[PDB]
Each structure stands twice: as structure tokens, then as C-alpha cells.
């Protein structure tokens, strides 16, 4: 099966039973090549047959394309539930359930915006009040005021 990639950076799809595509036919016998992935003789004299070929996955027309990215490159599922829509000048990442960043060091270079509550270091930010000196160690009344 063909898995595009070079310079140590490839792409793979989780194929299972019943997927369709295309198959090509090699010129000569490739088994001796497929054992070692180096220069080798043809094993036999059989030529231009499907016995030793190459499979290319495909989905043809079985997918759903969302109305917003009708002009933007998409990397999605069949149903469009999860998307990576690379538009001409902006990017949109869609995941109905949840998303994760396994990186131990993130970075940003501009203004950031959240639309709901925050949780940092195991505690909350939308209601935080710091104790002061007078009154002694009393809770700062209220939570998160502009």
C-alpha cells in the first residue's frame, strides 16, 4: 500500500476490510526487492501483471462537505465531524467532542480570546480572590470583576 512521504515525514490512513481504491501493475517481479528494499534482480520473467502491483486508497464521492469550506482545503472524516480547514488566510479546527495539545511548551504571538470558563493548574480563573493583609487573611469579596 502506498504511504506518501519522504525525508522522514509520512501520511497514513487506517485502512480496514472493505475499502476501495486503485491497483497498478509493475513492469517486473518485485518480491526480491520487497525483501530488502535495495537493488536486486527480477525474480522471474513475468511482466505487466497484477500479481506484483501497488495499491492506492481512495474514497471517490462518499463524503459530506460543509457549506463553510466550499472553497478551502479540508482534512476531515467522511461525515465532516472533525475538520482541519485551511483557508486562504485563516485556519479553523473543528472537533465536536474535545481536542488536546500534548506539547509541554506552547507559544502565542498575539491577542487571545476565550468564550467560557478557564481552569489553570487545577484551579479556576473565572472566580479568584486573593487574600490580603487587612482584614487578616480574609477572602477577597466576589470573583472575577473587570
Amino acid at each position: 500500500v502506498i504511504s506518501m512521504g519522504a525525508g522522514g515525514f509520512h501520511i497514513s490512513f487506517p485502512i480496514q476490510q472493505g475499502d476501495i481504491g486503485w491497483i497498478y501493475a509493475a513492469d517486473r517481479d518485485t518480491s526480491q526487492f520487497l525483501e530488502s528494499l535495495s537493488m536486486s534482480k527480477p525474480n522471474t520473467g513475468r511482466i505487466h501483471k497484477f500479481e506484483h502491483g501497488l495499491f492506492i486508497p481512495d474514497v471517490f464521492r462518499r463524503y459530506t462537505i460543509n457549506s463553510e469550506d466550499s472553497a478551502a482545503m479540508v482534512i476531515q472524516s467522511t461525515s465532516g465531524a472533525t475538520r482541519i480547514s485551511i483557508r486562504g488566510d485563516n485556519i479553523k479546527i473543528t472537533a465536536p467532542s474535545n481536542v488536546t495539545v500534548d506539547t509541554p511548551q506552547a507559544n502565542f504571538t498575539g491577542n487571545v480570546t476565550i468564550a467560557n470558563t478557564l481552569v489553570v493548574n487545577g484551579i479556576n480563573v473565572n472566580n479568584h480572590g486573593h487574600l490580603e493583609n487587612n482584614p487578616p487573611d480574609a477572602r477577597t469579596k466576589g470573583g472575577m470583576i473587570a
Binding site: 518480491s31 526480491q32 525483501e35 530488502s36 535495495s38 536486486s40 534482480k41 525474480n43
Partner: peptide, 10 residues
């Protein structure tokens, strides 16, 4: 370096 070998020769 391998030049001529069988299908199984490693």
C-alpha cells in the same frame, strides 16, 4: 554487498 541471491537470502 549483495549482488545475486535467492528470494530468502537476508
Amino acid at each position: 554487498l549483495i549482488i545475486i541471491d535467492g528470494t530468502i537470502g537476508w
